[PDB]
Amino acid sequence: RFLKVKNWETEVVLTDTLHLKSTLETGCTEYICMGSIMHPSQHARRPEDVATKDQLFPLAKEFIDQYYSSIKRFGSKAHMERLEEVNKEIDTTSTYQLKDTELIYGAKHAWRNASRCVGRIQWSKLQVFDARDCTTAHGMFNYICNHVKYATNKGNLRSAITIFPQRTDGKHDFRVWNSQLIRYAGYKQPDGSTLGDPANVQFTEICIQQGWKPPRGRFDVLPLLLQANGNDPELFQIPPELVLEVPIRHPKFEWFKDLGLKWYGLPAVSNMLLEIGGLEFSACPFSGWYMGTEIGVRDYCDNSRYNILEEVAKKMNLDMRKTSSLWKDQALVEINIAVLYSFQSDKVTIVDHHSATESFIKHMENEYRCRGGCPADWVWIVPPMSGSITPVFHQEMLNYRLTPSFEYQPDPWNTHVWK
Amino acid sequence: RFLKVKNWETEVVLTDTLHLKSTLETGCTEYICMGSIMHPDVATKDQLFPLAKEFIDQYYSSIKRFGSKAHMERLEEVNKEIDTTSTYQLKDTELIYGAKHAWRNASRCVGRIQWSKLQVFDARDCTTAHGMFNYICNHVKYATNKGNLRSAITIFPQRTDGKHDFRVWNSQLIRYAGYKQPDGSTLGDPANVQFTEICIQQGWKPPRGRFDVLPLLLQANGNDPELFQIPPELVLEVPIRHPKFEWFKDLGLKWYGLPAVSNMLLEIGGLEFSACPFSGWYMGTEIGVRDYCDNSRYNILEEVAKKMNLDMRKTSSLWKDQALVEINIAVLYSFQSDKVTIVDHHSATESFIKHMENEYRCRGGCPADWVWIVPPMSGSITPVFHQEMLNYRLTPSFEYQPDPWNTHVWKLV
Ligand code: HEM
Ligand code: HEM
Ligand SMILES: N=C(Nc1cccc(CNCCc2ccc(-c3ccccc3)cc2CN)c1)c1ccco1
Ligand SMILES: N=C(Nc1cccc(CNCCc2ccc(-c3ccccc3)cc2CN)c1)c1ccco1
Ligand SMILES: C[C@H](O)[C@H](O)[C@H]1CNc2nc(N)[nH]c(=O)c2N1
Ligand SMILES: C[C@H](O)[C@H](O)[C@H]1CNc2nc(N)[nH]c(=O)c2N1
Ligand SMILES: [Zn+2]
């Protein structure tokens, strides 16, 4: 039993065995493929809330077993006691506690297993901030500020994740309500349009409704909305000297800087769920650095986002009569050129989509040579511009779900009964 | 049971019931997705009976005659034939219906809003390669229509025992030749180098130029394939120029206007039509992104970037991206100027979203392959990018088949 993937530029074939260790459903069947569904499956590893012992322990025994095999100590003295130790905690607390090394292993391996991440060649170079001692929203704000400041590192960005206490009964969850630590506000206008970032309108309204005083500009950094041990969330303002921002200019078009555009330097995903041996860390903000397309193809150019193509085209003097002039395509390129050139000018880490995609091909090779496989989601790996002129477009990929993992989770306002 | 797909740009939600009617593999398992795998002797009497029943039932349902007197007589007729002859023959009505639906069911095709407007040429009376050449010439002339292209397919005799297959050995009816040089370089189209060697061996005397139309290699009834030169007056060609860069014409570039796919298999009710060339018209990016800029292809980015004085030292200047756009602008401007039918990728994807919605309304779903529907450039600024799509295999369908020089056992000398 194998499966081969082939790269149709280079004719390199790769033999995948790692997929035999797949645990969760992808959503597909032999009669239907769901590889372009956003959230295809709802196959979770334990039931919704406080699991019984025979539900939680088998997941724990798997993770510990996997960790001790990783370090060539399977069945060793330490491993056997660790099993017995996790049994006692589950028996007396209906949960258990990860060792500091187990916690680091798991975070790095959830990144490694993130089939959608084009960036995983860095997976083992992740800094882990243990914040499992935290108890309040103020403490969360302290931990998050240190995260942001370490990771920003004056622009030489560093990957980090900060791990808050795990879910216990489902009522005492820790949650960052922000989807990223640094996003811009979006404002519903009287004339029906949208000022700022339309993705965040709803979140911006919850902030205003929670007492935030909006500047009502186009690039207003949003407050943090931190929730600790299930209490009501609390607004904090990130100290601006911690929010690195790049003004976007263009190496050719001098008029570009007059579009009054900037973006933040640190992408810090903060609404996902980290799962390790059946433990669920509902607040695990992680951050690395941007691929240029993320800002310039999606953030600036989606219709339901900043939607700035029309403006950039006008200033370029393009025939916007019909689509066949390819005026969107042209403007779209000049933008991502401008974004790259600006980050590089301010010595802020950023990677282009040719470098990133090439990296990931190399990562694939490494993973197949040393691990027998590497899960990859072609729909998400291929950059959203210039797909076929990058090497991943011609790379076949197998997609399967390995644990530890990052998972989606409901937005907390759909589920939070206030006080 | 139902399934939902969402458009994350518009928030439209469609409900797929049609997926229940599929019964072929996708290659995916319940624990592994093969969505990006490119490609994941003949049927006995027993295997053919149900296949034919499914198709006949579907046809008669389609014309609001299910369970009718004509329906049951046709079904009993098909049975007599499989009993007697171990195969059966489609009526003309069923052949048209089947060929139209295989296009409709082609999950990888973004042009399916046009599916019901398809001209079917019945060529099941054909017996020789000369016969095939005649049929293909009439296909090309009808489809090209002086630049106002019309979709058509020509269907040759179905498979029998596998020993008497009809095959077009060309992958398209009109492609340019490729020639490896002693110094390793390549003249013409690198994609076709192998097929070029085969033709040259079979006796074709090549011009050894950059845009030589390859000869047809036609196999009828399991015999050795035979060479024919498509009459040059039937090959409509477009010289590629750019509306702003006057230096572009000096690249010497041209393309053929008629995409005519000939290496595939058409399956209707268990019958396999191993030779079924079909044609429509181009999306610009097929020539412009893939045919010129793929590195295993004509590979003209560097030359275009040079003439643009682009900074080609570092990727992050995005010279490849910038050059690719201009080449695609030229392709579209060239065809539109010569009034040859073509569709740009924005128009194409827009129409496909419209077609998908209509198909969910009146048919209960529409199988689609995101990995193929999204254009190979500027993906996220076309609406299919944000459109969730279910993939499953309806039949009749088009199908891959092995290249005939891998399996043909030669006859002469
Ligand atoms: C260091 C440079 C990194 C780059 C360039 C990068 C790049 C990307 C990009 C472009 C995406 C697609 C996201 C989108 O388009 O919305 C993605 C997905 C993802 N990345 Fe990475 N990433 C990096 C670091 C990390 C780190 C440190 C982690 C976790 C520790 C991570 C985990 C993930 C996950 C879980 C997803 C899937 C998210 C989802 O399904 O919404 N990445 N990555
Ligand atoms: C009328 C205009 C049409 C347009 C603009 C169009 C567009 C396209 C494009 C761009 C592709 C991807 C091709 C590739 O990337 O290699 C494709 C695939 C395909 N098309 Fe259409 N098409 C048209 C008509 C037709 C017709 C008339 C048929 C058959 C009757 C057909 C059947 C298919 C099939 C079977 C595929 C998938 C091919 C494969 O699996 O390799 N198309 N189409
Ligand atoms: N470089 C980076 N970037 C990056 C990486 C991972 C994830 C993201 C953000 N990804 C969110 C995309 C998304 C996911 C789920 C839904 C969704 C919402 C509600 C229900 C169901 C699904 C919607 C979206 C919006 N497209 C950015 C980065 C951040 C940290 C390290 O690296
Ligand atoms: N507009 C059109 N275009 C179009 C439509 C359908 C199909 C194609 C050609 N599609 C070829 C892609 C392909 C498929 C399989 C393999 C392959 C090779 C070896 C082993 C297995 C598979 C290689 C390729 C080349 N990429 C073009 C068109 C033609 C007729 C009407 O409309
Ligand atoms: C490996 C990968 O599936 C392959 O390169 C695919 C991707 N998507 C494609 N999409 C289209 N339209 N045509 C293609 O040839 C391909 N090739
Ligand atoms: C419908 C489609 O699956 C969805 O819009 C996906 C497509 N691929 C993507 N790829 C990345 N990197 N990010 C995305 O948000 C998406 N969106
Ligand atoms: Zn799948």
From Swiss-Prot, chain B:
Positions annotated to bind (6R)-L-erythro-5,6,7,8-tetrahydrobiopterin: S36, V371, W372, F385
Q: Which residues cross the membrane?
A: none
Give the record's keywords alphabetically: Calmodulin-binding, Cell membrane, Cell projection, FAD, Flavoprotein, FMN, Heme, Iron, Membrane, Metal-binding, NADP, Oxidoreductase, Phosphoprotein, Synapse, Ubl conjugation
Q: Where is this protein localized, as stated in its record?
A: Cell membrane, Sarcolemma; Cell projection, Dendritic spine
Kindly list the biological process annotations in GO that this record carries: arginine catabolic process; calcium ion transport; cell redox homeostasis; cellular response to growth factor stimulus; establishment of localization in cell; multicellular organismal response to stress; myoblast fusion; negative regulation of blood pressure
Which organs or tissues contain this protein? Isoform 1 is ubiquitously expressed: detected in skeletal muscle and brain, also in testis, lung and kidney, and at low levels in heart, adrenal gland and retina. Not detected in the platelets. Isoform 3 is expressed only in testis. Isoform 4 is detected in testis, skeletal muscle, lung, and kidney, at low levels in the brain, but not in the heart and adrenal gland.
Q: Which domain of life is it from?
A: Eukaryota
- One GO term of the cellular component aspect? cytoskeleton
Q: Select a single GO molecular function from the record's annotations and give it.
A: calcium channel regulator activity
Principal subcellular localization: membrane
Post-translational modification (record): Ubiquitinated; mediated by STUB1/CHIP in the presence of Hsp70 and Hsp40 (in vitro).
- Sites binding L-arginine sit at Q172, W281, Y282, E286
- Binding of heme b: at which residues? C109, Y400
Please state what the annotation says regarding this protein's domains.
Answer: The PDZ domain participates in protein-protein interaction, and is responsible for targeting nNos to synaptic membranes. Mediates interaction with VAC14.
Family indicated by similarity:
Belongs to the NOS family.
Biological function: Produces nitric oxide (NO) which is a messenger molecule with diverse functions throughout the body. In the brain and peripheral nervous system, NO displays many properties of a neurotransmitter. Probably has nitrosylase activity and mediates cysteine S-nitrosylation of cytoplasmic target proteins such SRR.
Q: What is this protein called?
A: Nitric oxide synthase 1
* Lineage, top ranks: Eukaryota, Metazoa, Chordata, Craniata, Vertebrata
Q: Which residues of the full protein are shown?
A: 304 to 722 of 1434
